[PDB]
Amino acid sequence: EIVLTQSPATLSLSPGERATLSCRASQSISTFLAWYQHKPGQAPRLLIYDASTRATGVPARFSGSRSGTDFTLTISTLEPEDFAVYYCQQRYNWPPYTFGQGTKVEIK
Amino acid sequence: IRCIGVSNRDFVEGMSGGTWVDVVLEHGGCVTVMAQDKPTVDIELVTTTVSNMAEVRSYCYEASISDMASDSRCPTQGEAYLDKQSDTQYVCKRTLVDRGWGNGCGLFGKGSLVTCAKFACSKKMTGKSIQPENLEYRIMLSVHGSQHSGMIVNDTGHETDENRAKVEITPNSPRAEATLGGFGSLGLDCEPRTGLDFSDLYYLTMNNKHWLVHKEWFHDIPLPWHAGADTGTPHWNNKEALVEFKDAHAKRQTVVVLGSQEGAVHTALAGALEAEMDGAKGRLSSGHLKCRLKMDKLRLKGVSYSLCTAAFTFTKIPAETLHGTVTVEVQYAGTDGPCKVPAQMAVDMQTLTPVGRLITANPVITESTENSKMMLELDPPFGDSYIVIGVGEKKITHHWHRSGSTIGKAFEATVRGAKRMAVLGDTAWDFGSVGGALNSLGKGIHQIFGAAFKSLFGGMSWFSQILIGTLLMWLGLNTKNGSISLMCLALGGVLIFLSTA
Amino acid sequence: WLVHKEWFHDIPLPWHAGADTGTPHWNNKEALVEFKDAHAKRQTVVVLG
Amino acid sequence: AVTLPSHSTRKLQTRSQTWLESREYTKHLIRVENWIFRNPGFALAAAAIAWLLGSSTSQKVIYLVMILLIAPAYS
Amino acid sequence: AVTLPSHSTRKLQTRSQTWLESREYTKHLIRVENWIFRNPGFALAAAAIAWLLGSSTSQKVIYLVMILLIAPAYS
Amino acid sequence: VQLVESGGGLVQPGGSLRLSCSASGFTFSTYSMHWVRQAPGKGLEYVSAITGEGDSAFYADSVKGRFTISRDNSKNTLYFEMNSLRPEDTAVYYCVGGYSNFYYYYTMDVWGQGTTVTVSS
Known part of the structure; x- marks a missing residue:
């Protein structure tokens, strides 16, 4: 099965700082990768699908990029409501889908 | 969009009538129609509901049997009669049984025995x-241009997405207009009554x-x-053969049901x-509809757009469809606004001369936030060529190579035409049907020949047809008369009718 | 019989x-189960009655 | 499945009646009559094919009968 | 009952596959092959009868084939 | 467009449970449904899926054999009948749905609030 590895286990940033998260697949996913935002006591919220396409109503600050097997989620201007856990999910051919271990964006 | 990967799609080019093109729609595949200077529209028949x-x-x-009964008579009396013969729920059978002097009446001939059993059907x-009325067709059509690759098999909202439309067609409203915001409207006049033998x-x-x-x-x-x-x-008209009345060695009767x-x-x-x-409606997923496409209120949204020059980044790869075409998904970097996308199949590096054809109408990105996604496709030449997208100093050039020369293409086109004719009959003549006189004459002679052929043959399936085809092939091969051709000719039809399906 | x-x-x-x-354990696994194919996108399995 | 060979090939012969004896006669005749009644034009096709085959009249009639027999069964 | 006419006579023609398509070719071949494999003596008898009928060689071969097809179906 | 989940609670080891997920606001039959669970202090785990029409179902190895996904398109309800529960199955389960045209594939999804399932110990 394909595995997704997010690089930073936990990320500590001040409000307004740039935020960068990288998710690496064990094998080629041509353009199938999604990014979700999950807050405690809330359902996980879809942010980006197809790597760079923003879901309905997602603010423009969230951006997605791809390079081979390395996908990047970027948050230009951090706002306080953005500090949560962020997950990557593989939407490749078969339903065997793996969620990355997640990265915590913390207010240092 | 709609048909990139359908693998049973065909291209209907141009409109020599200036306004309309006749088109036959089928459940299996879909039709991408490209006009002179109008946006390419992909049309597909989706479902046919009957109501x-x-x-x-x-x-x-599945029958079930119940309490049997019987009655016998002397070798010389009348005939047996159970009073359950005056009930239309009992199957009754009458026969002759050996009787006499042991059984109960002094005489030795054949008696008469009646047996009756109650019939019940579980299911x-x-x-x-x-009726050929009150049956509805649902056509889904979409347009090329600004859609990103995601919107290919996604049917969630077509009410407001400005690029897809759904058309309901019934005998009471055989014509419709598909309104595409900014593209105008495609008129669609269809023949529902006669689509499929209903x-x-x-x-x-x-x-x-x-x-x-x-x-x-x-x-x-x-x-x-x-x-x-x-x-x-x-009440069942016949309880016959759902019930078997055997008899033992001349001295009984037995009633069984078949399972x-x-x-x-x-x-x-x-x-x-x-x-x-x-519910009360029945969905068929295999059908045949004929629609003429009045394509005279379609416009091009991209006209009078200043061509975007920021950057272009490939997002997935340049890929090749099953029919030869090439799809490309591009991401635009620096937002200018609504703007035209430059793209071509070019060759000489200095005089970028448009070789081949572009089948994605004219690409235009309609969104400007930071980066946008769009998908186009194009029909490149058979030789090596370059996919060139951009304006100046940032034209990422890809090297493309197509396999098969024009000869194979014409062969495949003839194969597709033969298959469509075998499937549709005379109607196949209406696929590209701008309409002349050679076309109408061909359709008429095909109607007559098809009527005759279906009257004579067409009561057989893949084996009787192969047998009779081989037999008539030998017959025409060695008859030596003037009918030779006829025999052989008839087989072609027969034989292809067996080898194309 | x-x-x-x-x-x-x-x-x-x-x-x-x-x-x-x-x-x-039945060896054949066919001639009673029918794998019909949709129009190039699906497979469906039915049994004969 | 689809084939299911008939047991009448190996008909067990005895004084007592067999499983479905009363039906055989009408079985085959009904199948042939029904198929011909539904598709009449194939009678003309078979007449032509039989006429083109076989020299004598008896051969042509036998060809006609055997074609009209073999077609409804698709044998 | 016993007859149950086949629907392949009126096969509906469209792009999508029909109800039992993959079994049409095998079905008839298997029936004929099985019946002949069980009864070779009738192959000999049919060869003789075909030889007695029909003047030319092709007529006799066609008679042989048509008998070998009619026999398994009892058509 | 919403998914309301129910049926979570306390269960004994080896025990059984049935979770339900009622869909509203869309044509349920056109949506492939999925079950994703999250153990306490653990990442999300995609465990099960079913096609829009109910034809075929997929189960992750971690649950394959014990859990059965099903759906009723007339009652607009997805079900996750999980038997032989183990303490490792104690987690918050969330049913998700996405418009599907191909057995399980989806792009934009919709999530329920989740329901807690606790193995006793």
């Missing part, structure tokens, strides 16, 4: 009639499985049949279409 | 061999 069918003649395929299959096809249900079935196959069935409105106590019959009908059904049902 | 021992070997139906200790 308010009328139950007709339900059959019984029966029922057929319903389909005057001989009953709808058949056995147990939560539904089929389309011809007449004369739902009337030549040897099974106990009611006659429509099952109201109170059920459940539901596997014989499954095999008896062959060449009958599969259908499903939602 | 009494059945000729040549009509009871040319039968196209799933067949066990001998008596069944527990749940039988």
Whole structure:
């Protein structure tokens, strides 16, 4: 099965700082990768699908990029409501889908 | 969009009538229509629903028997009579039985024995009639241009997405206008009444499985049949053959039922279409619709757009469809606004000369936030060529190579034409049907030949046809008369009818 | 019934061999299960009645 | 499945009647009559094919009968 | 009952596959092959009868084939 | 467009449970449904899926054999009948749905609030 590895286990940033998260697949996913935002006591919220396409109503600050097997989620201007856990999910051919271990964006 | 990956799609080019093109739509594939200076539209027939069918003649395929009884007579008396012969719920059979002097009457000839048994059917299959009215077609059409690759198999909101439309077509409204915001509207005039023989096809249900079935196959069935409105106590015209009246060695009678019959009908059904049902309506997924496309209110949204020059980044790769074309998904970097996208199949590096054809109408990105996604496709030449997207100093050039020369392309086109003719009959002449006189003459002679052929042959399936084809092939091969050609010619039809499906 | 021992070997139906200790293993796996194909995108499995 | 060989090939012969004896006669005749009644034009096709085959009249009639027999069964 | 006419006579023609398509070619071949494999003596008898009928060689071969097809179906 | 989940609670080891997920606001039959669970202090785990029409179902190895996904398109309800529960199955389960045209594939999804399932110990 394909595995997704997010690089930073936990990320500590001040409000307004740039935020960068990288998710690496064990094998080629041509353009199938999604990014979700999950807050405690809330359902996980879809942010980006197809790597760079923003879901309905997602603010423009969230951006997605791809390079081979390395996908990047970027948050230009951090706002306080953005500090949560962020997950990557593989939407490749078969339903065997793996969620990355997640990265915590913390207010240092 | 809609048809990139369908693998059974065909391109209808141009409109030599200036306004319209006739087109036959089929369930299997879809039609991408490209005009001179109008946006390419991909059209697909999706589902055909039939509504308010009328139950007709339900059959019984699993009988059950009940308390038998019998009566005998002297070798010289009348005939046996059970009082349960005056009841239309009992199957009764009369025979001759050896009697005499041991059995109870002094005489030795053959007696008369009657046996009766009560008949009950646990379940029966029922057929319903389909009028060629009150049946609806649903056509889904979409447009090229600004859509990103995601919006290919995504049917969530077509009400507001400005680039996809859904058209409902019934005999009461055989024509419609598909309104595409900013593109105008595509007029669509269709022939619903005559799409697919719906005057001989009953709808058949056995147990939560539904089929389309011809007449004369739902009337030549040897099974106990009611006659429509099952109201109170059920009546079966024939309890015959659902009940077997044997007799022992001249001194008994025995009544048995044959078991459940539901596997014989499954095999008896062959060449009958599969259908499903939602509520009172029946969805068929294999059909045939003919629509003329009045394409004279279509515009090009991208005209009078300043061409975007920021950057272009490939997002997935340049890929090749099954028919030769090439799809590309590009991401635009620096937002200018709504703007035209430059793209071509170019060759010489200095004089970028448009070689080949671009089948994505004129690409234009309609969104400007930071980066946008769009998908186009194009038909490159057979030799090596370059996909060139951009304006100046940032034209990422990809090297493309196409496999098969024009000869193979024409061969495949003839193959597709032959298959479509075999499937559709005379109607195949209407696929690219701008309309002249050679076309109409061909269609007329095909109508006459098809009528004659279907009258003579066309009562056979893939084996009787192969046999009779080989036999007539030998016959014409060695007859030496002037009829040779006729024989051989007839086989071509026959033979392809067997080797193309 | 009494059945000729040549009509009871040319039968196209799933067949066990001998008596069944527990749940039988049937070798054929076909001629009673039909894998029909949708219009180039799906597969559906039905059984004959 | 689809084939299911008929047991009438190996009809067990004895004084007592067999499983479905009363039906055989009408079975085959009914199948042939029904198929021909539904498809009449193939009678003309078979007449032509039989006429083109076989020298004598008896041969042509036998060809006609055997074609009209073999077609409804698709044998 | 016993007859149950086949629907393949009126096969509905469209792009999508019909109810039992994959079994059409095998079905008839298997029936004929099985019946002949069980009864070779009739192959000999049919060869003789075909030889007695028909003047030319092709007529006799066609008679042989048509008899070998009619026999398994009892058409 | 919403998914309301129910049926979570306390269960004994080896025990059984049935979770339900009622869909509203869309054509349920056109949506492939999925079950994703999250153990306490653990990442999300995609465990099960079913096609829009109910034809075929997929189960992750971690649950394959014990859990059964099903759906009723007339009652607009997805079900996750999980038997032989183990303490490792104690987690918050969330049913998700996405418009599907191909057995399980989806792009934009919709999530329920989740329901807690606790193995006793």
